[PDB]
């Protein structure tokens with residue numbers, strides 16, 4: 778993948794989500810939670826100023842907020858997901874935002890990037906990859 782810009786500001790609505798089940802299973806998220814969440818449309822709100830990100834992922838079941846500064850390791854406590862601690866580091870690789878979440882689970886992280894007018898997110902854990910695509914709702918520019 779390749780990002781067309783580093784500016785990820787805006788509100789984005791999920792248009793596809795593939796193998797979210799596999800990803801959730803790899804995180805040991807319980808059956809009942811998986812069944813509720815698997816096909817609920819998510820919305821992502823990204824507030825970005827340079828390297829400083831504030832993000833919200835919302836649905837009619839659960840939300841998940843994570844804020845970070847690119848380059849700076851932080852303690853991500855994954856409440857409402859698997860309730861673990863990971864040492865999260867988000868970096869740019871070209872115009873792809875790459876997160877590695879170091880902790881118990883192997884190969885845990887995500888990659889997020891813009892192509893033209895859509896936002897793409899790939900979530901990984903263990904041997905599972907989930908691919909998501911979000912259409913634009915709002916951008917500042």
Ligand SMILES: CC1=C(/C=C/C(C)=C/C=C/C(C)=C/CO)C(C)(C)CCC1
Nearest residue numbers: 814832834836839840841843858887889
């Ligand atoms: C598993 C699971 C969820 C996971 C959301 C995730 C994994 C969000 C990741 C956000 C990161 C990648 C921010 C940058 O986009 C939500 C809360 C939807 C519903 C409850 C079950």
